[PDB]
């Protein structure tokens, strides 16, 4: 579960870089889409943090 947490947290960093790239390219609609992927990864990472604390 600690491996899944590190995978989804580095996937959130990847999407944050895609959001930065979209904003420099003026594609604000893709920046919002990337931020939505980032949010679902940080919210599932909090579920894995909870699972890991119990474990």
């Amino acid at each position: 579960t600690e491996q899944r947490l590190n995978q989804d947290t580095q996937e959130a960093k990847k999407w944050e870089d895609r959001a930065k790239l979209a904003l420099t390219n003026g594609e604000e609609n893709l920046a919002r889409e990337a931020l939505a992927r980032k949010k679902s990864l940080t919210d599932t990472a909090a579920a894995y943090q909870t699972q890991l604390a119990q474990q």
């Binding site: 895609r18 790239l21 979209a22 390219n25 594609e27 893709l30």
Partner: protein, 49 residues
């Protein structure tokens, strides 16, 4: 000729089918922004050399 023209529009319709496939390519397109800037960055270095 008119019914054959209706048959010719089957090729035109097939062109839009490739356009819907290209729609998936538009979501993938951010990779082309990094690809295009990269080739100009090494080309600028090659021109400067």
């Amino acid at each position: 000729f008119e019914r054959m023209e209706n048959k010719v529009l089957d090729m035109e319709a097939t062109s839009q089918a490739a356009g819907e496939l290209a729609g998936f390519g538009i979501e993938n397109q951010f990779a082309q922004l990094e690809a295009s800037s990269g080739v100009e960055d090494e080309l600028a270095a090659l021109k400067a050399s």
